[PDB]
Amino acid sequence: HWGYDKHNGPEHWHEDFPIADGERQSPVDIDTDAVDQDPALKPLALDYGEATSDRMVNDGHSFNVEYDDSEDKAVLKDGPLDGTYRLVQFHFHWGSSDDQGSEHTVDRKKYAAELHLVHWNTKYGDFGTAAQEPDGLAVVGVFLKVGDANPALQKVLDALDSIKTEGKSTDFPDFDPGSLLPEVLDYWTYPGSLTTPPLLESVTWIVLKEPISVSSEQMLKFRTLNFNAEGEPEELMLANWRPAQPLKDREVRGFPK
Ligand SMILES: [Zn+2]
């Protein structure tokens, strides 16, 4: 049962999921004195106005806000991409104290948490087919910097008491995922992987340069979730981040530089 504790955490994942030691694993440190420009890169296009959130679910690893991805209500295009990517869900990673918790780092700096907006390439018909392809998935990562409380985020945090344990779900309508974005969408990109098992090497990462905020009090709420199901031994989600993995000569590109 993979997790984040000392016996089942990231340093052990390679036993059941050997791709953990792969060529294109995520997250990574983004060293900003090593980032390259590429005139092929474009502005990020996030078309989220019509998005329809459905529900929030404690999956035993984090919690996911699920979207209707049966059509193009919430899509990602451009940036480094060459197709149309539908938003299926977003979730977060966070740490046990506010000084740590992001998966990506920027010149070794750790934010308090990181938002992952997970998308899949429509041409593959569904998420599972897409997850097996190098160009199949695209994840937008947004740092959460501890400081000012964030009203958009509060709406997510207000629902977490309804999904405290694994397998619980709650209705969650009308949440605009764009409300969790910075105003300007400058980004870094590189080829990588999912940051949880199965760790599949199918993700084009788009990591936004500008964090959104979170308060220290808000951060407490993330840590109240339970990894386990009702009636099982409790183990709170105090931390659920994978550390930086080796870049292995992949190119990190930046837009606009
Ligand atoms: Zn994630």
Residue numbers in the entry: 4 to 260
List passages from the publication reporting this PDB structure:
A well-studied carbonic anhydrase II was selected for rational design as it has efficient CO2 hydration activity and could be heterologously expressed in Escherichia coli. Thus, to better understand the key factors controlling halophilicity in enzymes and to develop a halotolerant biocatalyst for hypersaline conditions, we undertook rational enzyme design by selecting just one of several mechanisms present in halophilic enzymes: increasing the incidence of acidic residues on the enzyme surface. Herein, we describe for the first time the successful redesign of a mesohalophile enzyme to an extremely halotolerant orthologue, that is, one that is active at 3 M NaCl and above, by altering 18 surface residues. In contrast to suggestions that large differences in accessible solvent area, non-polar surface area or absence of large hydrophobic amino acids are the important features that allow halophilic enzymes to function optimally in high-salt environments, we have found that increasing the number and distribution of surface acidic groups alone is sufficient to impart this characteristic.
The conversion from mesohalophile to extreme halotolerant enzyme is conducted in stages to assess the effects of substitutions on overall protein stability and degree of halotolerance. Crystal structures of WT and engineered enzymes were obtained to confirm the presence of changed residues, that active site residue positioning was unaffected and also to compare the overall structural similarity of the designed proteins with that of WT. The structures of the four engineered enzymes superposed almost perfectly with the WT enzyme (maximum root mean square deviation (RMSD)=0.42 Å for M4) with no significant differences apparent in their secondary structures. Some of the orientations of other surface residues of M1–M4 were also altered compared with the WT, although none, with the exception of N62D, were in the vicinity of the active site. Up to 18 amino acid substitutions were made to the enzyme surface of bCAII, but this did not significantly alter the secondary structure, catalytic activity or stability of the designed enzymes, compared with WT, in the presence of added salts.
